[PDB]
Amino acid sequence: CHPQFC
Amino acid sequence: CHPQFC
Amino acid sequence: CHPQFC
Amino acid sequence: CHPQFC
Amino acid sequence: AEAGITGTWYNQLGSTFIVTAGADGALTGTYESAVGNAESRYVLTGRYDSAPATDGSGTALGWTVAWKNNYRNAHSATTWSGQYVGGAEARINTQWLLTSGTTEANAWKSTLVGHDTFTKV
Amino acid sequence: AEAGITGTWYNQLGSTFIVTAGADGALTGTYESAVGNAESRYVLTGRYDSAPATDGSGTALGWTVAWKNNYRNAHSATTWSGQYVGGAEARINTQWLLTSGTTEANAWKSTLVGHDTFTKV
Amino acid sequence: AEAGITGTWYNQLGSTFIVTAGADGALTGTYESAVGNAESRYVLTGRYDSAPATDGSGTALGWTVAWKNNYRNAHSATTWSGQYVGGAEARINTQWLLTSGTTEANAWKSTLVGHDTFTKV
Amino acid sequence: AEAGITGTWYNQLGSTFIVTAGADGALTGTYESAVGNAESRYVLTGRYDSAPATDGSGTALGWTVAWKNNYRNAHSATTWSGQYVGGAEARINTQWLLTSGTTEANAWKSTLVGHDTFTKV
């Protein structure tokens, strides 16, 4: 998952 | 306006 | 023309 | 790698 | 998918697109603009993944429409890339690219990017 | 255009695409990946503007390739949107969108954007 | 705009972004990912049009976030380009590009494209 | 990177952009259009990955420019997303999004997508 999302 | 829309 | 270019 | 490339 | 793609789809603006998904991945149909007059219809051709994953993944697809028909020639083409998600409320979520033919000096402003969501309703 | 589009095109990476532009705007052909082995070939379908402007504008076109064939199924599709510019050194300049089928949670990472320039050489 | 941009915005996924629009076009703030834990916060900087048209046009803006902070380094950056529309239900509609640092061989898969709509609610 | 980013960059069209990459990820500078007259200069702000991977990966970055200054207000903003690759011939390869403020009816044509490669030469 990527920080932009999580 | 362009056909994609109108 | 737009500043990004001219 | 993906077919678009390989 | 396939059976699930075939049909009429509408986007948040009214545009209607009717496609036939064929056994082997072909997508063929027409795209009609708002108003819905006899021929604001353009031809579309595309391809989809006919053997998509059996997990809850969407079905990748894309199609192209050249904005030329017997009444209008807008000298441009749009490609939509996206995936079909089936179910109670199936939808095709897309991102599109619209490129107009320009001279080499105006190429910079040749392509518009946007997104469209199509539903059966 | 039309006659001028028909043929083999190569992009900066080696990928080869062979298309037939038909009288009425259809684009049909195959796309082959690097290596160039028997079947790294996929089917492509698209449309172009068959009555482009007579001024020095390019010819708008786009096509789609679903990355599924009899040896590989990458569960994705790519659409290329762009224009053909003819002349001594003709080329098709494009921007593409590659979408992979994902689950609704991974949709955010489903589409890659890039660009490709194809030449006859 | 300006006064109207300053504040907290939320997108359809929960991500929260807090910006200060300055007199002269600067945009500064933080972006926080879902969960909303102490530091899933990243710094954002952008610019907007501080003298937008007086007709009902939106206010063009964009910002960047590098996904590096004191707990995480995702080696990537996202830029959001869009416009602010004020009113009862103001919103910023954007298209974003997320690029990850790759080696020259993987550059093709370096950029993802998507869209986000942010509301104050 | 950082030290390597700081400096003047030129794109295939002449546009010059001068940036200062700061210790902590900030990118600040000006963008100048062709002609190179006193003020075809606009302010740019962005962020980069200041702790990029030690393998041969590029450095992710992005910046924004609002096309408003003391002589011109084009009511638009452009964001560039990309990566810096250093070396003998360093370059920043980008994809950009240019959005113009429009009315809600013309939003569809609000964003142009393109790409730019910048070199120090």
Side-chain angles (χ1 to χ4, degrees), chain G residues 50-75:
Chain G
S50 43
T54 35
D55 41 48
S57 281
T59 298
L61 43 69
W63 67 87
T64 307
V65 173
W67 304 104
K68 177 181 176 300
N69 78 7
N70 297 327
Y71 309 77
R72 177 78 176 117
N73 186 356
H75 313 294

PDB file of all heavy atoms in Angstrom, chain G residues 50-75:
ATOM      1  N   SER G  50      -3.797  33.548  -7.930  1.00  0.00           N
ATOM      2  CA  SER G  50      -4.352  34.483  -6.906  1.00  0.00           C
ATOM      3  C   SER G  50      -5.209  35.585  -7.476  1.00  0.00           C
ATOM      4  O   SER G  50      -5.788  36.346  -6.739  1.00  0.00           O
ATOM      5  CB  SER G  50      -3.149  35.083  -6.090  1.00  0.00           C
ATOM      6  OG  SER G  50      -2.165  35.378  -7.087  1.00  0.00           O
ATOM      7  N   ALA G  51      -5.292  35.681  -8.761  1.00  0.00           N
ATOM      8  CA  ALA G  51      -6.130  36.737  -9.396  1.00  0.00           C
ATOM      9  C   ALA G  51      -6.940  36.003 -10.460  1.00  0.00           C
ATOM     10  O   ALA G  51      -6.766  36.283 -11.634  1.00  0.00           O
ATOM     11  CB  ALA G  51      -5.252  37.796 -10.056  1.00  0.00           C
ATOM     12  N   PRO G  52      -7.775  35.080 -10.049  1.00  0.00           N
ATOM     13  CA  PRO G  52      -8.558  34.237 -10.982  1.00  0.00           C
ATOM     14  C   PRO G  52      -9.643  35.062 -11.714  1.00  0.00           C
ATOM     15  O   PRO G  52      -9.947  36.178 -11.337  1.00  0.00           O
ATOM     16  CB  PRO G  52      -9.093  33.124 -10.066  1.00  0.00           C
ATOM     17  CG  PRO G  52      -9.332  33.865  -8.741  1.00  0.00           C
ATOM     18  CD  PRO G  52      -8.072  34.742  -8.629  1.00  0.00           C
ATOM     19  N   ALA G  53     -10.232  34.507 -12.736  1.00  0.00           N
ATOM     20  CA  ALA G  53     -11.265  35.311 -13.453  1.00  0.00           C
ATOM     21  C   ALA G  53     -12.498  35.533 -12.589  1.00  0.00           C
ATOM     22  O   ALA G  53     -12.841  34.663 -11.824  1.00  0.00           O
ATOM     23  CB  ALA G  53     -11.659  34.590 -14.733  1.00  0.00           C
ATOM     24  N   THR G  54     -13.106  36.676 -12.778  1.00  0.00           N
ATOM     25  CA  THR G  54     -14.326  37.092 -12.034  1.00  0.00           C
ATOM     26  C   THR G  54     -15.588  36.448 -12.581  1.00  0.00           C
ATOM     27  O   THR G  54     -16.674  36.692 -12.099  1.00  0.00           O
ATOM     28  CB  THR G  54     -14.400  38.629 -12.132  1.00  0.00           C
ATOM     29  OG1 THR G  54     -13.891  38.940 -13.436  1.00  0.00           O
ATOM     30  CG2 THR G  54     -13.427  39.330 -11.182  1.00  0.00           C
ATOM     31  N   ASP G  55     -15.434  35.643 -13.583  1.00  0.00           N
ATOM     32  CA  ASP G  55     -16.631  34.978 -14.158  1.00  0.00           C
ATOM     33  C   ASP G  55     -16.719  33.691 -13.339  1.00  0.00           C
ATOM     34  O   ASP G  55     -15.927  33.503 -12.440  1.00  0.00           O
ATOM     35  CB  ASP G  55     -16.407  34.688 -15.670  1.00  0.00           C
ATOM     36  CG  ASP G  55     -14.986  34.188 -15.940  1.00  0.00           C
ATOM     37  OD1 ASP G  55     -14.562  33.299 -15.225  1.00  0.00           O
ATOM     38  OD2 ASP G  55     -14.405  34.735 -16.859  1.00  0.00           O
ATOM     39  N   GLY G  56     -17.632  32.813 -13.628  1.00  0.00           N
ATOM     40  CA  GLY G  56     -17.688  31.578 -12.791  1.00  0.00           C
ATOM     41  C   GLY G  56     -16.661  30.534 -13.186  1.00  0.00           C
ATOM     42  O   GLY G  56     -17.019  29.399 -13.447  1.00  0.00           O
ATOM     43  N   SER G  57     -15.426  30.915 -13.217  1.00  0.00           N
ATOM     44  CA  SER G  57     -14.361  29.953 -13.592  1.00  0.00           C
ATOM     45  C   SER G  57     -13.786  29.428 -12.281  1.00  0.00           C
ATOM     46  O   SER G  57     -13.996  29.997 -11.228  1.00  0.00           O
ATOM     47  CB  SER G  57     -13.263  30.650 -14.363  1.00  0.00           C
ATOM     48  OG  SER G  57     -13.742  30.810 -15.697  1.00  0.00           O
ATOM     49  N   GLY G  58     -13.070  28.352 -12.366  1.00  0.00           N
ATOM     50  CA  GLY G  58     -12.481  27.778 -11.141  1.00  0.00           C
ATOM     51  C   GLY G  58     -11.138  28.423 -11.022  1.00  0.00           C
ATOM     52  O   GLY G  58     -10.752  29.161 -11.917  1.00  0.00           O
ATOM     53  N   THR G  59     -10.479  28.138  -9.933  1.00  0.00           N
ATOM     54  CA  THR G  59      -9.124  28.671  -9.618  1.00  0.00           C
ATOM     55  C   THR G  59      -8.129  27.567  -9.813  1.00  0.00           C
ATOM     56  O   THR G  59      -8.166  26.619  -9.056  1.00  0.00           O
ATOM     57  CB  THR G  59      -9.064  29.112  -8.165  1.00  0.00           C
ATOM     58  OG1 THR G  59     -10.012  30.160  -8.000  1.00  0.00           O
ATOM     59  CG2 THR G  59      -7.689  29.715  -7.754  1.00  0.00           C
ATOM     60  N   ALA G  60      -7.266  27.695 -10.778  1.00  0.00           N
ATOM     61  CA  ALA G  60      -6.224  26.693 -11.098  1.00  0.00           C
ATOM     62  C   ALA G  60      -5.203  26.630 -10.021  1.00  0.00           C
ATOM     63  O   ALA G  60      -4.862  27.713  -9.566  1.00  0.00           O
ATOM     64  CB  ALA G  60      -5.541  27.103 -12.384  1.00  0.00           C
ATOM     65  N   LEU G  61      -4.788  25.445  -9.659  1.00  0.00           N
ATOM     66  CA  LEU G  61      -3.764  25.254  -8.624  1.00  0.00           C
ATOM     67  C   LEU G  61      -3.103  23.863  -8.797  1.00  0.00           C
ATOM     68  O   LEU G  61      -3.496  23.059  -9.627  1.00  0.00           O
ATOM     69  CB  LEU G  61      -4.459  25.393  -7.226  1.00  0.00           C
ATOM     70  CG  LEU G  61      -5.816  24.663  -7.149  1.00  0.00           C
ATOM     71  CD1 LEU G  61      -5.669  23.145  -7.194  1.00  0.00           C
ATOM     72  CD2 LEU G  61      -6.483  25.024  -5.850  1.00  0.00           C
ATOM     73  N   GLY G  62      -2.105  23.592  -8.028  1.00  0.00           N
ATOM     74  CA  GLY G  62      -1.399  22.293  -8.057  1.00  0.00           C
ATOM     75  C   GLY G  62      -0.466  22.341  -6.860  1.00  0.00           C
ATOM     76  O   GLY G  62      -0.166  23.437  -6.406  1.00  0.00           O
ATOM     77  N   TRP G  63      -0.056  21.203  -6.400  1.00  0.00           N
ATOM     78  CA  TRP G  63       0.865  21.072  -5.264  1.00  0.00           C
ATOM     79  C   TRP G  63       1.558  19.769  -5.450  1.00  0.00           C
ATOM     80  O   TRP G  63       1.136  18.949  -6.256  1.00  0.00           O
ATOM     81  CB  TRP G  63       0.102  21.095  -3.922  1.00  0.00           C
ATOM     82  CG  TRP G  63      -0.862  19.905  -3.583  1.00  0.00           C
ATOM     83  CD1 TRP G  63      -0.527  18.724  -2.978  1.00  0.00           C
ATOM     84  CD2 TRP G  63      -2.173  19.943  -3.845  1.00  0.00           C
ATOM     85  NE1 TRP G  63      -1.700  18.118  -2.915  1.00  0.00           N
ATOM     86  CE2 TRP G  63      -2.750  18.763  -3.404  1.00  0.00           C
ATOM     87  CE3 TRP G  63      -2.967  20.936  -4.459  1.00  0.00           C
ATOM     88  CZ2 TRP G  63      -4.126  18.572  -3.592  1.00  0.00           C
ATOM     89  CZ3 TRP G  63      -4.342  20.736  -4.638  1.00  0.00           C
ATOM     90  CH2 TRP G  63      -4.918  19.554  -4.204  1.00  0.00           C
ATOM     91  N   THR G  64       2.599  19.625  -4.709  1.00  0.00           N
ATOM     92  CA  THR G  64       3.434  18.442  -4.705  1.00  0.00           C
ATOM     93  C   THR G  64       3.660  17.919  -3.287  1.00  0.00           C
ATOM     94  O   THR G  64       3.728  18.707  -2.354  1.00  0.00           O
ATOM     95  CB  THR G  64       4.845  18.772  -5.326  1.00  0.00           C
ATOM     96  OG1 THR G  64       4.658  19.358  -6.595  1.00  0.00           O
ATOM     97  CG2 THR G  64       5.724  17.529  -5.544  1.00  0.00           C
ATOM     98  N   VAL G  65       3.771  16.629  -3.187  1.00  0.00           N
ATOM     99  CA  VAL G  65       4.047  15.943  -1.905  1.00  0.00           C
ATOM    100  C   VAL G  65       5.121  14.885  -2.283  1.00  0.00           C
ATOM    101  O   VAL G  65       4.931  14.159  -3.239  1.00  0.00           O
ATOM    102  CB  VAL G  65       2.826  15.187  -1.300  1.00  0.00           C
ATOM    103  CG1 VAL G  65       3.266  14.370  -0.048  1.00  0.00           C
ATOM    104  CG2 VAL G  65       1.782  16.145  -0.907  1.00  0.00           C
ATOM    105  N   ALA G  66       6.199  14.807  -1.550  1.00  0.00           N
ATOM    106  CA  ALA G  66       7.303  13.843  -1.749  1.00  0.00           C
ATOM    107  C   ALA G  66       6.947  12.915  -0.568  1.00  0.00           C
ATOM    108  O   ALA G  66       6.763  13.354   0.558  1.00  0.00           O
ATOM    109  CB  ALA G  66       8.613  14.500  -1.533  1.00  0.00           C
ATOM    110  N   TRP G  67       6.896  11.649  -0.819  1.00  0.00           N
ATOM    111  CA  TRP G  67       6.525  10.680   0.244  1.00  0.00           C
ATOM    112  C   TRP G  67       7.686  10.225   1.118  1.00  0.00           C
ATOM    113  O   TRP G  67       8.085   9.069   1.206  1.00  0.00           O
ATOM    114  CB  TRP G  67       5.760   9.441  -0.467  1.00  0.00           C
ATOM    115  CG  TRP G  67       4.550  10.007  -1.254  1.00  0.00           C
ATOM    116  CD1 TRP G  67       4.536  10.149  -2.614  1.00  0.00           C
ATOM    117  CD2 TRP G  67       3.374  10.469  -0.765  1.00  0.00           C
ATOM    118  NE1 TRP G  67       3.358  10.689  -2.855  1.00  0.00           N
ATOM    119  CE2 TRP G  67       2.583  10.925  -1.814  1.00  0.00           C
ATOM    120  CE3 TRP G  67       2.849  10.560   0.542  1.00  0.00           C
ATOM    121  CZ2 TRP G  67       1.316  11.455  -1.574  1.00  0.00           C
ATOM    122  CZ3 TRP G  67       1.582  11.093   0.780  1.00  0.00           C
ATOM    123  CH2 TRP G  67       0.827  11.536  -0.281  1.00  0.00           C
ATOM    124  N   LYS G  68       8.207  11.229   1.760  1.00  0.00           N
ATOM    125  CA  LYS G  68       9.319  11.018   2.666  1.00  0.00           C
ATOM    126  C   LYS G  68       9.026  11.851   3.870  1.00  0.00           C
ATOM    127  O   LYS G  68       8.625  12.994   3.722  1.00  0.00           O
ATOM    128  CB  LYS G  68      10.594  11.494   2.036  1.00  0.00           C
ATOM    129  CG  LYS G  68      11.723  11.330   3.058  1.00  0.00           C
ATOM    130  CD  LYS G  68      12.998  11.827   2.416  1.00  0.00           C
ATOM    131  CE  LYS G  68      14.118  11.768   3.422  1.00  0.00           C
ATOM    132  NZ  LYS G  68      13.755  12.629   4.571  1.00  0.00           N
ATOM    133  N   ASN G  69       9.204  11.292   5.011  1.00  0.00           N
ATOM    134  CA  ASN G  69       8.971  12.026   6.270  1.00  0.00           C
ATOM    135  C   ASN G  69       9.878  11.328   7.339  1.00  0.00           C
ATOM    136  O   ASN G  69      10.776  10.613   6.945  1.00  0.00           O
ATOM    137  CB  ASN G  69       7.444  12.000   6.593  1.00  0.00           C
ATOM    138  CG  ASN G  69       6.829  10.758   7.175  1.00  0.00           C
ATOM    139  OD1 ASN G  69       7.513   9.816   7.523  1.00  0.00           O
ATOM    140  ND2 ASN G  69       5.528  10.732   7.301  1.00  0.00           N
ATOM    141  N   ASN G  70       9.689  11.489   8.627  1.00  0.00           N
ATOM    142  CA  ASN G  70      10.618  10.801   9.621  1.00  0.00           C
ATOM    143  C   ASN G  70      10.245   9.386   9.995  1.00  0.00           C
ATOM    144  O   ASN G  70      10.724   8.848  10.987  1.00  0.00           O
ATOM    145  CB  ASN G  70      10.657  11.545  10.927  1.00  0.00           C
ATOM    146  CG  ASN G  70      11.209  12.932  10.782  1.00  0.00           C
ATOM    147  OD1 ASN G  70      12.066  13.206   9.975  1.00  0.00           O
ATOM    148  ND2 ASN G  70      10.762  13.872  11.554  1.00  0.00           N
ATOM    149  N   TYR G  71       9.399   8.791   9.228  1.00  0.00           N
ATOM    150  CA  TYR G  71       8.982   7.409   9.553  1.00  0.00           C
ATOM    151  C   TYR G  71       8.874   6.534   8.344  1.00  0.00           C
ATOM    152  O   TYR G  71       8.875   5.306   8.400  1.00  0.00           O
ATOM    153  CB  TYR G  71       7.566   7.403  10.198  1.00  0.00           C
ATOM    154  CG  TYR G  71       7.435   8.376  11.362  1.00  0.00           C
ATOM    155  CD1 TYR G  71       7.298   9.726  11.115  1.00  0.00           C
ATOM    156  CD2 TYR G  71       7.466   7.905  12.658  1.00  0.00           C
ATOM    157  CE1 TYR G  71       7.201  10.603  12.157  1.00  0.00           C
ATOM    158  CE2 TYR G  71       7.366   8.789  13.689  1.00  0.00           C
ATOM    159  CZ  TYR G  71       7.235  10.135  13.435  1.00  0.00           C
ATOM    160  OH  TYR G  71       7.144  11.007  14.487  1.00  0.00           O
ATOM    161  N   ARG G  72       8.745   7.221   7.262  1.00  0.00           N
ATOM    162  CA  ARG G  72       8.576   6.522   5.992  1.00  0.00           C
ATOM    163  C   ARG G  72       9.252   7.193   4.793  1.00  0.00           C
ATOM    164  O   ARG G  72       9.295   8.406   4.735  1.00  0.00           O
ATOM    165  CB  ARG G  72       7.053   6.441   5.917  1.00  0.00           C
ATOM    166  CG  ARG G  72       6.457   5.822   4.670  1.00  0.00           C
ATOM    167  CD  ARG G  72       6.537   4.316   4.704  1.00  0.00           C
ATOM    168  NE  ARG G  72       5.823   3.823   3.484  1.00  0.00           N
ATOM    169  CZ  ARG G  72       6.434   3.144   2.539  1.00  0.00           C
ATOM    170  NH1 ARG G  72       7.747   3.127   2.443  1.00  0.00           N
ATOM    171  NH2 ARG G  72       5.682   2.481   1.700  1.00  0.00           N
ATOM    172  N   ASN G  73       9.771   6.413   3.892  1.00  0.00           N
ATOM    173  CA  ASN G  73      10.376   7.034   2.702  1.00  0.00           C
ATOM    174  C   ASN G  73       9.908   6.070   1.611  1.00  0.00           C
ATOM    175  O   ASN G  73      10.416   4.972   1.393  1.00  0.00           O
ATOM    176  CB  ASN G  73      11.925   7.114   2.704  1.00  0.00           C
ATOM    177  CG  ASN G  73      12.281   7.927   1.431  1.00  0.00           C
ATOM    178  OD1 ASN G  73      11.421   8.270   0.659  1.00  0.00           O
ATOM    179  ND2 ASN G  73      13.479   8.287   1.076  1.00  0.00           N
ATOM    180  N   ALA G  74       8.904   6.489   0.899  1.00  0.00           N
ATOM    181  CA  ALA G  74       8.351   5.653  -0.183  1.00  0.00           C
ATOM    182  C   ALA G  74       9.028   5.960  -1.535  1.00  0.00           C
ATOM    183  O   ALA G  74       8.607   5.449  -2.547  1.00  0.00           O
ATOM    184  CB  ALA G  74       6.898   5.923  -0.305  1.00  0.00           C
ATOM    185  N   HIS G  75      10.050   6.766  -1.541  1.00  0.00           N
ATOM    186  CA  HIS G  75      10.813   7.135  -2.781  1.00  0.00           C
ATOM    187  C   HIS G  75       9.895   7.457  -3.966  1.00  0.00           C
ATOM    188  O   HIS G  75       9.977   6.840  -5.019  1.00  0.00           O
ATOM    189  CB  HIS G  75      11.794   5.957  -3.179  1.00  0.00           C
ATOM    190  CG  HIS G  75      12.584   5.458  -1.964  1.00  0.00           C
ATOM    191  ND1 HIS G  75      13.476   6.130  -1.286  1.00  0.00           N
ATOM    192  CD2 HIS G  75      12.486   4.230  -1.319  1.00  0.00           C
ATOM    193  CE1 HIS G  75      13.924   5.413  -0.275  1.00  0.00           C
ATOM    194  NE2 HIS G  75      13.310   4.256  -0.309  1.00  0.00           N
TER     195      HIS G  75
END
